[PDB]
Design an enzyme around this catalytic site. Sequence first.
Site, PDB file in Angstrom:
ATOM      1  N   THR A 235      16.345 -15.743  28.572  1.00  0.00           N
ATOM      2  CA  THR A 235      17.223 -15.597  29.772  1.00  0.00           C
ATOM      3  C   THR A 235      16.513 -14.851  30.905  1.00  0.00           C
ATOM      4  O   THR A 235      15.742 -13.919  30.665  1.00  0.00           O
ATOM      5  CB  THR A 235      18.532 -14.851  29.416  1.00  0.00           C
ATOM      6  OG1 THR A 235      19.242 -15.582  28.407  1.00  0.00           O
ATOM      7  CG2 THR A 235      19.436 -14.686  30.635  1.00  0.00           C
TER       8      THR A 235
ATOM      9  N   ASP B  97      19.280 -18.213  35.249  1.00  0.00           N
ATOM     10  CA  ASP B  97      18.796 -19.514  34.793  1.00  0.00           C
ATOM     11  C   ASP B  97      19.859 -20.132  33.884  1.00  0.00           C
ATOM     12  O   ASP B  97      20.907 -19.527  33.663  1.00  0.00           O
ATOM     13  CB  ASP B  97      17.455 -19.385  34.063  1.00  0.00           C
ATOM     14  CG  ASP B  97      17.612 -18.912  32.633  1.00  0.00           C
ATOM     15  OD1 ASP B  97      18.176 -17.814  32.423  1.00  0.00           O
ATOM     16  OD2 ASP B  97      17.177 -19.644  31.718  1.00  0.00           O
TER      17      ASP B  97
ATOM     18  N   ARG C 102      19.137 -21.892  30.598  1.00  0.00           N
ATOM     19  CA  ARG C 102      18.655 -22.268  29.267  1.00  0.00           C
ATOM     20  C   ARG C 102      19.208 -21.331  28.202  1.00  0.00           C
ATOM     21  O   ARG C 102      19.152 -20.112  28.356  1.00  0.00           O
ATOM     22  CB  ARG C 102      17.126 -22.239  29.208  1.00  0.00           C
ATOM     23  CG  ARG C 102      16.568 -22.494  27.812  1.00  0.00           C
ATOM     24  CD  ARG C 102      15.059 -22.359  27.769  1.00  0.00           C
ATOM     25  NE  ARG C 102      14.387 -23.448  28.470  1.00  0.00           N
ATOM     26  CZ  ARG C 102      13.067 -23.591  28.557  1.00  0.00           C
ATOM     27  NH1 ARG C 102      12.251 -22.710  27.985  1.00  0.00           N
ATOM     28  NH2 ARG C 102      12.557 -24.619  29.220  1.00  0.00           N
TER      29      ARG C 102
ATOM     30  N   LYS D 153      25.682 -18.830  32.622  1.00  0.00           N
ATOM     31  CA  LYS D 153      25.489 -17.411  32.306  1.00  0.00           C
ATOM     32  C   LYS D 153      26.199 -16.494  33.298  1.00  0.00           C
ATOM     33  O   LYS D 153      26.258 -15.282  33.089  1.00  0.00           O
ATOM     34  CB  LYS D 153      23.999 -17.083  32.264  1.00  0.00           C
ATOM     35  CG  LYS D 153      23.218 -18.012  31.352  1.00  0.00           C
ATOM     36  CD  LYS D 153      21.808 -17.518  31.105  1.00  0.00           C
ATOM     37  CE  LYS D 153      21.018 -18.548  30.316  1.00  0.00           C
ATOM     38  NZ  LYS D 153      19.667 -18.048  29.957  1.00  0.00           N
TER      39      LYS D 153
ATOM     40  N   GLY E 243      21.068 -11.635  26.254  1.00  0.00           N
ATOM     41  CA  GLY E 243      21.132 -11.133  24.880  1.00  0.00           C
ATOM     42  C   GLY E 243      21.902 -12.074  23.967  1.00  0.00           C
ATOM     43  O   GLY E 243      21.783 -13.297  24.086  1.00  0.00           O
TER      44      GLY E 243
ATOM     45  N   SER F  90      14.760 -11.840  28.959  1.00  0.00           N
ATOM     46  CA  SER F  90      13.367 -12.017  28.536  1.00  0.00           C
ATOM     47  C   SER F  90      12.431 -12.327  29.701  1.00  0.00           C
ATOM     48  O   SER F  90      11.231 -12.056  29.627  1.00  0.00           O
ATOM     49  CB  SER F  90      13.258 -13.118  27.475  1.00  0.00           C
ATOM     50  OG  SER F  90      13.710 -14.364  27.978  1.00  0.00           O
TER      51      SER F  90
ATOM     52  N   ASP G 258       8.406 -17.617  31.942  1.00  0.00           N
ATOM     53  CA  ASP G 258       9.018 -17.184  30.679  1.00  0.00           C
ATOM     54  C   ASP G 258       9.508 -18.393  29.879  1.00  0.00           C
ATOM     55  O   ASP G 258      10.275 -19.212  30.387  1.00  0.00           O
ATOM     56  CB  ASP G 258      10.181 -16.220  30.946  1.00  0.00           C
ATOM     57  CG  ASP G 258      10.916 -15.815  29.678  1.00  0.00           C
ATOM     58  OD1 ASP G 258      10.258 -15.601  28.637  1.00  0.00           O
ATOM     59  OD2 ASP G 258      12.161 -15.707  29.731  1.00  0.00           O
TER      60      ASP G 258
ATOM     61  N   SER H  76      13.330 -18.759  29.349  1.00  0.00           N
ATOM     62  CA  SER H  76      14.132 -19.208  30.487  1.00  0.00           C
ATOM     63  C   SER H  76      13.701 -20.598  30.933  1.00  0.00           C
ATOM     64  O   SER H  76      12.558 -21.004  30.712  1.00  0.00           O
ATOM     65  CB  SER H  76      13.986 -18.230  31.650  1.00  0.00           C
ATOM     66  OG  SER H  76      14.107 -16.893  31.200  1.00  0.00           O
TER      67      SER H  76
HETATM   68 MG   LIG Z   1       9.370 -27.248  27.302  1.00  0.00          MG
END
Ligand SMILES: [Mg+2]
Lengths: 204, 125, 4, 4, 4, 195, 195, 222, 196, 196, 233, 212, 222
Positions: free
Chosen positions: H1, H17, H19, H33, H47, H129, H166, H169
């Site tokens: 995230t 983001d 994902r 989110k 988290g 992250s 990252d 994300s």
């Molecule tokens: Mg990929």
Amino acid sequence: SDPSSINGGIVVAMTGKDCVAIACDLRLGSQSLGVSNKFEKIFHYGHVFLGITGLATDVTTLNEMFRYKTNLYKLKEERAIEPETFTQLVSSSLYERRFGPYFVGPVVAGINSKSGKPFIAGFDLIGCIDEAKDFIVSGTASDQLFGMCESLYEPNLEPEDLFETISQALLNAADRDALSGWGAVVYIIKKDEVVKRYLKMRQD
Amino acid sequence: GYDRALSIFSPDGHIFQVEYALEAVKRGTCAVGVKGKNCVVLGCERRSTLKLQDTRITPSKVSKIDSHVVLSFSGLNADSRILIEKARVEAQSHRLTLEDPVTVEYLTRYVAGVQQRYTQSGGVR
Amino acid sequence: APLX
Amino acid sequence: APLX
Amino acid sequence: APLX
Amino acid sequence: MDIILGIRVQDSVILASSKAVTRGISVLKDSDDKTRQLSPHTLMSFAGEAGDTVQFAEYIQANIQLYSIREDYELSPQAVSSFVRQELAKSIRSRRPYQVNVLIGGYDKKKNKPELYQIDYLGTKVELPYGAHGYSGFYTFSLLDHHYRPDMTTEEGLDLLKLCVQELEKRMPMDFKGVIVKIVDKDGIRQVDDF
Amino acid sequence: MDIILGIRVQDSVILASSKAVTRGISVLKDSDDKTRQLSPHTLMSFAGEAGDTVQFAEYIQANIQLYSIREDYELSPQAVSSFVRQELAKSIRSRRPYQVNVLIGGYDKKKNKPELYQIDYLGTKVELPYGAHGYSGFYTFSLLDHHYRPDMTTEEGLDLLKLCVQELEKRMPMDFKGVIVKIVDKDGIRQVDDF
Amino acid sequence: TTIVGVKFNNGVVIAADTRSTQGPIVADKNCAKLHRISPKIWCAGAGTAADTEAVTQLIGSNIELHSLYTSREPRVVSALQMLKQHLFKYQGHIGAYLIVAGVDPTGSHLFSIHAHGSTDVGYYLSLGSGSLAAMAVLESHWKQDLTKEEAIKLASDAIQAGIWNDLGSGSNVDVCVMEIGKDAEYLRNYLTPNVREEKQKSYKFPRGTTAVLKESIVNICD
Amino acid sequence: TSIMAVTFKDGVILGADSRTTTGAYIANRVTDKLTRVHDKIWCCRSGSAADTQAIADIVQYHLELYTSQYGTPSTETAASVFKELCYENKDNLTAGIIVAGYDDKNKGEVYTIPLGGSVHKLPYAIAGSGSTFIYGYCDKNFRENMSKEETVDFIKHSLSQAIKWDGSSGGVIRMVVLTAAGVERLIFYPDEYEQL
Amino acid sequence: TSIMAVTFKDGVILGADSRTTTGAYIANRVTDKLTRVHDKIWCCRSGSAADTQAIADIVQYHLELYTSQYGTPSTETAASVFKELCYENKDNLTAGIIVAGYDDKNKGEVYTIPLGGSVHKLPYAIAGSGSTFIYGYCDKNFRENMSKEETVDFIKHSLSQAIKWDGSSGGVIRMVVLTAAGVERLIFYPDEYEQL
Amino acid sequence: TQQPIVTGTSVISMKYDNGVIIAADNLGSYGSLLRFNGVERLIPVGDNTVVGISGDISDMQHIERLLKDLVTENAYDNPLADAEEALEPSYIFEYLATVMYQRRSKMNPLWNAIIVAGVQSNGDQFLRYVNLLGVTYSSPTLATGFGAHMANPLLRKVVDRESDIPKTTVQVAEEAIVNAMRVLYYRDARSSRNFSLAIIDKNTGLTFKKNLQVENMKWDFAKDIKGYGTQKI
Amino acid sequence: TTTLAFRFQGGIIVAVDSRATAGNWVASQTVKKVIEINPFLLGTMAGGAADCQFWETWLGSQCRLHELREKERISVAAASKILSNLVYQYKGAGLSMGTMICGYTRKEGPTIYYVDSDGTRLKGDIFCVGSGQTFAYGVLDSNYKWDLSVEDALYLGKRSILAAAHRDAYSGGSVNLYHVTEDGWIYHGNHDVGELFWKVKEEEGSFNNVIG
Amino acid sequence: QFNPYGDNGGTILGIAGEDFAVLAGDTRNITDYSINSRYEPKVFDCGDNIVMSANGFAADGDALVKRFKNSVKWYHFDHNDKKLSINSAARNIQHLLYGKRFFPYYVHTIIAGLDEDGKGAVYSFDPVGSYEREQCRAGGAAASLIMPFLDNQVNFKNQYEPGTNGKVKKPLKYLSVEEVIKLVRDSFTSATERHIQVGDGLEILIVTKDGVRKEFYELKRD
Ligand SMILES: [Mg+2]
Ligand SMILES: [Cl-]
Ligand SMILES: [Cl-]
Ligand SMILES: [Mg+2]
Ligand SMILES: [Mg+2]
Ligand SMILES: [Mg+2]
């Protein structure tokens, strides 16, 4: 001793044009030992369908729990529960056991009777709702199912075509997993008719 | 370790140390082997310049390598004990790994190979 | 053991 | 966790 | 390293 | 404890349970009956942790007998198996769970059909034509897959069972001291004395 | 491996060894001979860690046979047992010790006496009238303490042995698939085929 | 995230983001989110996904009841206080890491909350992250007295840094803008820079490819 | 953290760095560790951010309720409430707190409360991971009855060194002055204090 | 331990406490941690007593053999030999050593060798458990090109504070002066340095 | 089996149109103690290569000695030591990579992360990474430690792929590196304000810059921040 | 794995499955678990894939060197003992092997040796090795006679692997059959469990547990 | 305690045709949640029309490829420039891998080329040297995602002839190089969507009797 992979099994759900499909394998085992080839993982409360993978005792328990709750819902509300509402009920019930969870991977599928919109959803073992336009996967061959679905899936499939796609997704995924297989069932769901088909697959 | 090449070629193509070892065999007491239709017999000479001998305990000229194979010899008596010992050890080692006693050809091929090795190893005659 |  |  |  | 088997045939359910009770390096008993009658047409065999097995079996027995007296009526094998499953499902998240695996053999008088249920200590229920618990299945299941037919008689079922016991006696490491065999049918529960 | 017994009577030594070879939940063999002839009048039975047992037994066998050929003479049972003890005593402080327990039954031709030696994997040697290794002793020793007499015949020794096997078959948890029995006396080594 | 929050002239903006991952696998390629606590108080969560959703709904429910009880619009500090005292009570076992932002009668606010119950104040914040990738951008381009359009640009750029650099994300950028005196505008999929390219082939099977053993009509009616 | 509180002629001054750490990552470089529990009773927080925040909030609540019934609480009273929380919950807390306040009768007072929950009344106190590096400096340079300007310099120089050597300390140096005149906040930036 | 070495105008001075610890028991209260490896190359020892003694003895041997062949070794050379031993045997050693020496060409030099076996040439160095408490003090008070009397006072005051706060340091303050004039030993007792 | 004692933090680097830039701060940390401040962690090899090292400093000094010895050994019986047979960046890297992998394979690693930056004889930029595990990789931007998490994202905004390298000048590249070092000082707890920077250009050669400082920092907004939530004063 | 081999009137039947697994991941469905050591000798593979494949090929090289040196085919006993003595040297290092050396010679006749990684070496008529061995034993034991025809014995070996493939999660793929005679070993085909199961179910009337 | 292994992610894929073979692999290299390189090749031409890839722990992967390339070189020196056949290379690689049986190379190795009859060949290895020839093999992080798709599309598993009652299978046929590359590209784009360690770029090495050809394609960079 990993609760989510003792018994094995898989569930997959997909949306199409004015329809939804949900499918599951039939295996129940104890680690290496196959025990039952009749263990269906998909249940339904009215027109709302629920598939559950994971620890088999919890699969059975939750079915009995959601039958319990949707029956009381119907008596008080004087109407059948819808997929969107049921999804929230599943999420609430799982999170209630946050620090002692049911070791499951549920999947909701159905069509809203009022709007006619196809609906699918997935959860982790503690209630996190995963909504999706396309497909939801769950079980010991989820990696395999993600791979099959992502490549095979296209939007707005007709019921007859959608059947072929979801069936091939499940079968080929199950054959790359030791703890899944031993038969399969596919539910094709239209606005006011539901067809259930048992698939022929390899029995090893 | 003592390394000297003792067994070497001479101009005429001979290995004198091997040939001189044959002269030691020529000096040794006579030994004869004759095989029949269903048996083999090993005969051995014992020189009679030695009286007051104790034949009970004196080393016999014919030695059992295994229960089914025997070895006699001519030449240096002390040298023969080393060959006999190695042969006996190999006979038991063969039984242990192959689960079958040695053939006579195999046992011979082993002993001969030990003899050959001592003709092109450093520091040995 | 003795330290410094 | 955040420390000070 | 798979097993058999 | 250790070996419990079950076979559902045309008109009856047959349960076979090992007679040995072993503690340490000593076989303490060689005539132990690892079963309880829950109702006239329902029998439960059990195996697992020492003490827990009998304590659980008798507790279930008391509850079914209480139900029978209250309603003047016998619960169906399906109903009993569901009750038993729920009790084990409760147990697995308790402070100290019942470590007991069971088979439930019953004859449904309303349906006129034999029924065999397999339930493990987690509360995992399945209805089967034949069943086993523990290491027993690893030999018998494949044997029954081959020789079992759904239209067999009770006598054919007993011969099929003899074949399983013979295989276990040949390949199992432990001496389980033979088995007690019991049949469940329309006329109730009876024990085969010569096996 | 598991059960090895030994009884020294008036004129002979009798060794009894279990026939089972178990690996996991499967009895792989039920006719295994857990013994090696070291010399015409000396027999060694063995039990312990898989692989180590046979490897050790055959290694000892090779060494005694080598000695026999070299000296054209048979080593006494006492001499063989001391050699075996020393090899195990060396082994216990090695990088990977032989986990093998043995009984050595022999007939000393110079003394005209039977002799039974018990040696464990540590190199602990004792001469005994009767001996056992593993859990076998916990049943047999007390039984032999009662029924054993020093002046018994070979036939009386075999009956005494039958009594031990019967007790083991009754109270032992594992099925060891009976025993191979061998007798060592003045005339050498022979096997009892019907036991 | 990757989640961020940025204060500006007349309010605050948060972004995230889209994902969600189970291990190395992307479970959802377009999850939401950004959560609503109250109409003008929004929350970005990283988290444990179930914890962030559950804790935001519980406090959101209690905030509504509190708003009705007091006949007042809810304040960000109330949501902050209720969240932190709840999270502290559970000693970090509820794995909810949040960026709380909104407007109220007192003004515009921006906070972060960690799982153990510690809170922080700031003009720019990042969690998850991809927070390091995001914070690198924020530390490079942030300044005092940002406009609305500048803050949105900065926020979405910070999320993009996480998306690209990252592995935790990815996919899209969601945004929510909370400005004083105006309704909060939730911009779902504000940027979509990760569209899947056309596949090389159609995997639509000929009908009858799948072998079938049994068919049966299922009864859903009473 | 690096934190300290120092009594002087006119009252007491609290001092702190501004760094928050999650591992070697600085989670917050502009943290405020000097926190109000009452008008003229403040505290310096070190250890767990969550624990120290939760404690400070509870103390503030207790002193607000105290004030409603019995009027202004003493600095000793505030320290006692901190102690009670830190002592009784010692197994579950990581909180090193310095309590500082100004009475008119008692003037400036400083109480330090280490991990165990013991209380120590001192002329000045230093705490946090960075304090270790300035025990020598502070002991040699502290004098009683210093002026405001001298005390500010003492804290500035002290925390400057603590920040220089401690990786867990840094950012800005925040200070809070407590006197009869009122409550004054001070801030000092790297470019100033680094080249001291 | 508390140890340090400081370069100054005329050369270099080494300083140390005299405490050896086995747990909380003081095994030796009059220890000599300042150690000759060559006429005018000395070292301060901290960490394991056994390890540092064994290392110092080996270095002394190496430099004695060096001198027999190539004449007087440089301070850098001595530090290199220490490093080689500390680096190559890092897994089995607990030795924090400061090397100090006087050349006529290079004057006073100080090399510090921490646990890992790295080498750091510095104007002055501090080490040992007690050094932590005087990083602030030493950084603020050290000047280059100090006099003998100033440098002695600097070391005396520094180790005084280190001893005051560190339980693992104490006893007498030993010092060794290294100059062109020769080698001078100094000692300072508690009654003097405690009340500084 | 080791544990690092005295350690150096991030090393950051990137390619530009005519060469490469590399930078690293001058700190030698001892756990949380910021022990040594005069530590040079960029080491030039010849006039065409700079090796930037992070991790254990004792192992760094060992690697310095190896590179020093490599220059000596290359000069032996080599009339073209300062011409065609001079040490290339690719030779220096492969040597270190060999050593790093051999040491990890003996379960006794050099506890370092290394970036070799330079320019080859044909003018091609060289930039490659190796660490204690013997893992190697190359990229338009490379960074170690915290630099990997915070610097790489910033440097990748300038040079995101191969085609961006000709479009990036030395002025723009250096500006991004210096900015990245500031961000690391804000956010890395084991970083210092002081650092070194090296530029290896195919035209102007090796430029080594010492005693650089992070400047133009933003701290003023800290005064407005009060309390941790509800605090007004 | 499931592997078996048994002795009977007409020689030796050798049957194996073809599945490889890394945990619950099905790595392969086409693994050759019979190693063709030489035209006269077969080795079966169970446990570590590499361990078995490497050391049994190595075994073949040692058997070739024997017949070059001794001008005679190696015995099954001697071949098995080379392998067992090899693994015994590695005992404790972590080799994982459950093998069966099968062959036919004049002096011995049809012979089967079980060899495993903890040093066990057993001569025997019937052995089943692998994670599905117990399933194979059940069918094999309850149906074995020395006087089985070559045709019937081939089916029983095939049917036994199928039984295990069905029940054991870590056994499957296909069945590989071998017949071993004096003259040497003869291959009897690769039989996919996909088709073989339904074919056996229909023709035999077995597997009633499965939804037909 | 020092851990001598790491995971560099990425995924590889080998398919064999009638008169050709392909070995594909993504160009992304990772550690934990960070990207090390967007273009770091791990499929190599080793000479003698053999292509190779050793995916997993990159240091072990590079060491193995390096040693095999060197093995090919010495095979020429010792055997009069004889061409190393694919079957001989496979056996050689087994001995390289098994040589470190008790301290393994943490890699899944795949090689591709042509057999001695000119037909396409793919060989796959486990970390310790177990090997097998196959028409089809996926390796690495996303192997579990890709492999079941190949079973279905290359080897035609679970597909039956329409109208035949699931009696007759769809029959196997060799695929053209055009069809194979379509499957490779779709396999990797799918893996890129659902696996975080897969993306950035795709490099395919194609082997025919004429030589080794390369093709490169962009993948999603999130
Ligand atoms: Mg990929
Ligand atoms: Cl805080
Ligand atoms: Cl000392
Ligand atoms: Mg399967
Ligand atoms: Mg299977
Ligand atoms: Mg600092």
